[PDB]
Write a structure and sequence with these properties.
Chain A: It is found in: Nucleus. The complex is a heterodimer. By secondary structure, chain A is low in regular secondary structure. The radius of gyration of chain A is 7 Å and the shape is flat. The relative contact order of chain A is 0.29. By secondary structure, chain B is mainly alpha-helical. Chain B folds into 2 domains: 4-226, C8orf32 fold, CATH 3.10.620; 332-468. In chain B, 52% of the residues lie in helices and 4% in strands. Chain B contains 19 helices and 6 strands. In chain B, the strands form 2 sheets. Chain B has a 4-stranded antiparallel sheet, covered by helices on one side. Chain B has a two-stranded parallel ribbon with strand order 5-6. In chain B, β1 (153-156) and β2 form a beta hairpin. The relative contact order of chain B is 0.07. The chains are: A little secondary structure, B mainly alpha. Chains A and B meet through loops of A and α10 and α12 of B.
């Protein structure tokens, strides 16, 4: 399932 | 509570119609964060969370968006009585900011997964009563704007968000949580974290947004992920077009991570007439050097990842070395684990795999190989030097034996004849070490046979070998 990531953090 | 000029582009029936709305808002005195986040959330919901019935684009009707907007402004204005919090001279008080923060916080669902996608926007807050960590801080700023608190603004590090306010914009307040299993500091300043020299607070060189940079944030917060396997092309395109709009207006000048995000999007699908990804990565680095004392890590990580994807070994190593040169002047502190994890993956997975492939291509007769370039060896050393210096003075250690095995392996990928060409000079390639660990390792770094046990002893706290 898709996940949150801190906005505009690099990588996947 | 929208003004009549805000409504004339509806319905929004395309990506370009969304862009036109952002352009119109960014042309106003102050762009309406609540309107824009509702629009983005609405479109993301119907392009990523629930695409059932999608034909071109989820048409955003005025009556839907206005109803959502009114739910939000009613919730905030009914829960925050500004008369209890007198405002001298266009300055908000800490008690008022705390009140707004508590209204948002206390609105959220009691129990939900905080790492879910698509819970970043005010659409999520209104319809699902769910927000991610940084989404709370954004919502607090949007609420403040709805209340006419023009001095309250979003502050951003590379892994956390809070608010600035107050006389001259100098006051800070924590408004959301950070990480998992960390203790909340809501209402507090960020001064202890700046004073500690943690990465999380960037030694005070964090982003203080104006309203236009807050718009940029919400654009960077778009999440095209449908699942782990697949992204929405429409949401990628929307993000990309909105970033170019902000770029052209000057609003990414002080936002390194946004320039890197734009670069990544350009690599995937280049916009005719626009700067190349590499140019944009270099612009992100230049922004960090210009506005933030070159204290940011991710501008260099964005560049390194680009080179690593493109199998540019020399330039990848250079960029990680540059990353480490930034981290060396920080202390590794308790809530800095995300950047620890990034460095750990680079040292112990990414660089090993790059050098493994290089070793194969060298066997196949590559010319100009990184593995025969002493400057590349120097970059590898400078990477480790920065990590070791980072550890110096830190309340938490960084290195352990798990790092040592990969260091010995990576050193070993360069022939002794290459390694010998680097001159390590004290204060061909010349290198100065800043860390005491690497200074002590100097003589071991040029033996034809790398002394694995000696290296491990030098890199780690271990000082004895097995008794038996």
């Amino acid at each position: 399932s898709a996940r949150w990531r801190f906005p505009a953090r690099p990588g996947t | 509570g929208l003004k009549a000029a805000q409504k004339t582009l509806f319905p929004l029936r395309s990506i370009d119609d969304v862009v036109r709305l952002f352009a119109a808002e960014l042309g106003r005195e102050e762009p309406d964060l609540v309107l824009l986040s509702l629009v983005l959330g609405f479109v993301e919901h119907f392009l990523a969370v629930n695409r059932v019935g999608l034909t071109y684009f989820p048409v955003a009707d005025l009556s839907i968006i206005a109803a959502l907007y009114a739910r939000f402004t009613a919730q905030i204005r009914g829960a925050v009585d500004l008369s209890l919090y007198p405002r001298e001279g266009g300055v908000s008080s800490r008690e008022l900011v705390k009140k707004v923060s508590d209204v948002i916080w206390n609105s959220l669902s009691r129990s939900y997964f905080k790492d879910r996608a698509h819970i970043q926007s005010l659409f999520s807050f209104i319809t699902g009563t769910k927000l991610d960590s940084s989404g709370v801080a954004f919502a607090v700023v949007g609420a403040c704007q709805a209340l006419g608190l023009r001095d309250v603004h979003l502050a951003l590090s590379e892994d956390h968000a809070w608010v600035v306010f107050g006389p001259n914009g100098e006051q800070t307040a924590e408004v959301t949580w950070h990480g998992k299993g960390n203790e909340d500091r809501r209402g507090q300043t960020v001064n202890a974290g700046v004073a500690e020299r943690s990465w999380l607070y960037l030694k005070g060189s964090y982003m203080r947004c104006d309203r236009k940079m807050e718009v940029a944030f919400m654009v960077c917060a778009i999440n095209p992920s449908i699942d782990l396997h697949t992204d929405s092309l429409e949401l990628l395109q929307l993000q990309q077009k909105l970033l170019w709009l902000l770029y052209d207006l000057g609003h990414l000048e002080r936002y390194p991570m946004a320039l890197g995000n734009l670069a990544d999007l350009e690599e995937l699908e280049p916009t005719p007439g626009r700067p190349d990804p590499l140019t944009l990565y270099h612009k992100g680095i230049a922004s960090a050097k210009t506005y933030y004392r070159d204290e940011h890590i991710y501008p260099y990580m964005y560049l390194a990842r680009y080179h690593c994807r493109n199998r540019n070994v020399r330039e990848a190593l250079q960029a990680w070395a540059d990353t480490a040169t930034v981290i060396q002047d920080y202390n590794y502190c308790r809530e800095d684990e995300e950047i620890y994890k990034e460095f750990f993956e680079v040292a112990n997975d990414v660089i090993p795999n790059l050098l493994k492939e290089a070793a194969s291509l060298l066997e196949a007769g590559s010319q100009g190989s990184a593995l025969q370039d002493p400057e590349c060896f120097a970059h590898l050393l400078r990477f480790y030097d920065g990590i070791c210096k980072w550890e110096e003075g830190s309340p938490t250690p960084v290195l352990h034996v798990g790092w040592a095995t990969f260091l010995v392996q990576s050193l070993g990928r360069f022939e002794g004849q290459v390694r010998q060409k680097v001159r390590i000079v004290s204060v061909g390639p010349v290198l100065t070490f800043q860390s005491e660990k690497m200074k002590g390792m100097k003589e071991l770094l040029v033996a034809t046979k790398i002394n694995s046990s000696a290296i491990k002893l030098q890199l780690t706290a271990q000082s004895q070998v097995q008794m038996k």
